[PDB]
Write a protein that binds this ligand. Structure first.
Ligand SMILES: [Fe+2]
Ligand SMILES: [Fe+2]
Ligand SMILES: [Fe+2]
Ligand SMILES: [Fe+2]
Ligand SMILES: [Fe+2]
Ligand SMILES: [Fe+2]
Ligand SMILES: [Fe+2]
Ligand SMILES: [Fe+2]
Lengths: 355, 358, 358, 355
């Protein structure tokens, strides 16, 4: 036990708002990181049913608000899905309309069902189909909706709200007159900045985020097929392409990156771990994944977590069909702050034991 | 007051079964309009600080000798042991003979000398010598050891670390040197002597690290730079004549996560109040005066330490009649700047001065 | 008229003895107010071009077989053999079987296919296949060889080189491959298939060259990109809908010295005239019309070549009623942009159209 | 000889402004560069005498204009000193004054004698002493003069006029009202941006050239002495420091770089060659240099050329005194356009044979 002299010294230190470093929990400087976030897998059958169920059970108040957010069991206090990333599933009918606002939190919206979905980002209107995603970067006036001719749409939102909050950098304001006014032609952004290695001769665009705000499923699929003709990709991800800011080559946003990967028929990757958090969405196909020993058998439009520094591998159970996983992450924040670390699994042939 | 329907409550429980929830059930948005400081402003008098740090020598056990450091503990940040925001700060003491072993960690560190002479650090083979008000960098993942040269005196210094940030972001690594100490034949002070020149770099620059090649930042030349700056400008209305330390190779910040500044307040100067999104820890390098942080007045003198939480009104004052005052600071800024979270705002009311809340 | 004093003339000769002169003796400042084009605008009809290039096959000796190329010679730039400014351009022909050896040089090159199918180039092991209106890069100091695949036809292509610039700046190097040809097992078209995706890069990018990882730029997807661009904009008043090719890894230009553009002119479009500091060489990828360069009218059609000297008024027109016209171009721009020499100016007079000087 | 068929073919090619590549001089693509510029050495005794001599022999017309430009024998047509660089020696008395103008050509002015010399660059006034140099970068309003209390001053001008001209990028205009109007404090630039690894917290300066426009001799000398305590420098240059843009770490200007080197007592460097042109000015000391086999015995304030791809080495003949060479160059244009190449001499111990 401590000496009456020591216990008097710690008490003296507290009086001046100080302490002894030998008195704290030994993992103030840990040998390696250990995630507080736990691996979770969300079944599309459950999500579609419970989100649509919300329409008839929601009050006149709390318009939306009406989101089924993915709560990590170990991340309940900050309502995050993985690490410092927020994710919610939401729905709207044709003609429905949410007012414009801006926040310091960056966001992306990945459509998983329906047609007619749109987003105005700083006057640039963008229409989205299944497996397309739109960017709404930090500080931009954005609003969402469904076109009048559209169907009922269901999408996933990914934000860095928890990161924005914990860093004490959060800001919010509603549009001074509810909705943005713009005469800029529809889909101007993807149509002008969406060409392969191609940019307007005069680039009047000087913002640190991507000028391309919509990333299309079809051309991305087409490009992965092309990548399949010339490379095997990585041992840990297969044919993996990351989305870019075409002005810089860097990530689409300052805090968030996104990727799309293709797994060949019967392919089973090796396992690795890294310092970022990753949230996967199954854009196409059927298979399973092992993350932290736990097995997740996934189908089209399922969602699953991979916490930081957690062993993870992927597998396509289809016999003659490729599988495509969309994913977004906090990679840019890792890379910019020099915290990016990666390590392969040496045990087995590079594969986790499933219990 | 009014409980919502059993239908809704069945739905909430159904959502919990698949590890989800209804967003309208939370409550609360912690005010998304503007940041809420999680740290409290705190002052640390050098009188108390120095006196309590020396006491640790005779009280520390056989073990805990390597951990013999008094850390600045923010009363609202005890859970993560931060001094302010996601920044760690500690006070150490070593004597003429003493030296420590070398380790490497993901966290970045600053070592600002407060008292003494002939302190030294080895960073990846680069040996640097330090005096009062000088500081060194021990950046991400670099081999670093501390000690005092034979000809030196008893030293007291302040450590600055982004430890809470690194743990928080789940990215901290640690390993001791396999040989306990580093073996280096590189000439002494090679870094500040090759990279410390005013707007000058070696013609063939072989440095390939994202952080500064200049690892020691010297008090004397910094002070002389501020005297010169004073001849041509009044600087910022909110800090006086304020220069930030830089990475001479890129012109950016010294380290990827922490920035550092030195500022000179003219005799009798009272600065204007402002807010910003970073967390800043101040060490008084020279002089005497006060500061008002979030309503609280901190009368400081040489080597006092105080911090300013994010989005908190702050202003600085030099009480002296003839002599200038200098405030060293290290901060959170590179993380706010790179992630696009930087914001600043001036106090409009009361002539740019806070109402002092006793 | 009036000779200056023998005292002055003794002084001038004294200055020459130490290899100097009096600045007031020159005369002339070549007009320092604005640039003077050193190149003349020139048109090259495909009819003549193709016809004269094929003739070279039977006329060339045993030697000179490797040099069998008709270069575009600017009449006011014969001394340095440039097509326009400091840019070289030539026309080559190869048949289904033929292939050349590999060499490496400091100059950068573009190879734009004008006629034929199944052309190929190896760049540092990267094998690419080319069709009409596609082009490849053979950047600074890279191992490159050209040829036609077995299944291909007779090909005619245009080479674009910064040879005059490199000689002018005294920096050109040359060496043949020690093994005559390159040995590569890398899968065909690996570069455009891994780097040709719309806003997509391999998660682990291992390319570490200052120039583009994407070496083949394809006509078909470029054309489809312009049709899409047309749905949302009218582009520039001076070029119509104009996209430049980029380095997908940095977002900058494809090579450190040469830029390249493709532009689509809507049916019946007459563009506005402008000046700029670069030199541009145009190849007609699709359609028919005319252009006015420095007063001269050039009625062009598919695969005609013309250049625009620096600081020369130029405008483009599409004569067709239903179909769009496309103009490929490669240019000097990266050198003007990086050295801070870029300047542009619009024609104010005559509704933005030049007076055509017959 | 050529066949009547061939000579008719070349004639046909000329009619359409074309030629045969096998008919041109073989060194269109040379194996390596060979400089047209020749090594030259200008003696300070000659320069001081002939420049001062110009005052009494110049007409009322041609005010200045009154410059003794260093003409390379092989570069007479473009009036360059080396490669594409212009250099002239000029003088002014106290109170003398040249009007403000701007040009696309970048320039630097290296003071070699006298006191009171000044330059206003875009409102920023800068005073210069011996061995100090001021930048007047592309497109900036600049004017020169000597303070009323100053002495007779002699300086060297270094410009990239020939480069600006050959690239067809030259522009010029006189100030709409002759002289710049500014209330910005004297020496504001060196005093605010001249600190070692130190910049103002808010940097309102967004120009691609250096915010530090004056580089001082004394602190640069002081820094070379410090560099001498910890390194041997390069085998080919000794203790060589290059001047920087302190906002970027890059070169002070877009087309021009500058360096200052210290040679230790009795030091004799090895020889190398590179793709840039370099013009040296002897800021302090006495010694010799070998460039292209030719020996140049230099003294304080001498000037000498080193053409591109020409072997060059340096030597301090002083027994117990360091020698300092100032130099400026076209290195940034080489580096930015990827034309930078360097090669050591292997013959001898790395030393040229003097004939
Ligand atoms: Fe939002
Ligand atoms: Fe992964
Ligand atoms: Fe440490
Ligand atoms: Fe502040
Ligand atoms: Fe070639
Ligand atoms: Fe043009
Ligand atoms: Fe000038
Ligand atoms: Fe050299």
């Amino acid at each position: 036990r401590d000496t009456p002299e020591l216990e008097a010294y710690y008490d003296d230190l507290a009086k001046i708002e100080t302490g002894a470093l030998w008195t704290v929990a030994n993992d103030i400087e840990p040998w390696e990181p250990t995630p507080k976030s736990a691996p979770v897998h969300w079944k599309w059958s459950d999500l579609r049913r419970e989100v649509l169920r919300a329409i008839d059970l929601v009050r006149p108040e709390d318009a939306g608000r009406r989101v089924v957010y993915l709560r990590n069991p170990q991340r309940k206090d900050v309502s995050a899905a993985c690490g410092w990333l927020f994710s919610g599933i939401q729905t709207m009918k044709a003609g429905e309309r949410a007012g414009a606002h801006r926040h310091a939190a960056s966001a992306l919206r990945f459509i998983m069902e329906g047609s007619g979905a749109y987003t105005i980002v700083d006057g640039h209107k963008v229409e989205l189909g299944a497996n397309d995603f739109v960017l709404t970067p930090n500080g931009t006036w954005h609003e969402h909706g469904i076109l009048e001719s559209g169907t009922e749409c269901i999408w996933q939102d990914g934000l860095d709200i928890p990161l924005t909050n914990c860093l004490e950098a959060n800001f919010y304001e509603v549009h001074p007159n509810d909705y943005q006014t713009t005469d800029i032609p529809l889909n101007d952004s993807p149509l002008t900045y969406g060409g392969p290695a191609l940019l307007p001769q005069l680039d009047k665009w000087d913002k640190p985020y991507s000028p391309l705000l919509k990333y299309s499923w079809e051309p991305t699929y087409e490009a992965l097929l092309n990548y399949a003709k010339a490379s095997d990709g990585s041992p840990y991800d297969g044919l993996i392409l990351r989305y870019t800011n075409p002005q810089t080559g860097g990530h689409p946003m300052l805090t968030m990156g996104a990727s799309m990967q293709m797994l060949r028929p019967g392919e089973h990757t090796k396992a690795h771990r890294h310092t970022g958090n990753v949230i996967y969405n199954v854009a196409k196909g059927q298979g399973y994944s092992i993350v932290g020993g736990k097995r997740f058998d996934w189908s089209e439009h399922d969602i699953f977590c991979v916490p930081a520094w957690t062993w993870h591998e992927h597998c396509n159970t289809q016999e003659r069909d490729d599988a495509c996983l969309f994913s977004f992450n906090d990679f840019p924040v890792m890379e910019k702050l020099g915290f990016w670390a990666e390590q392969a699994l040496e045990d087995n042939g590079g594969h986790q034991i499933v219990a």
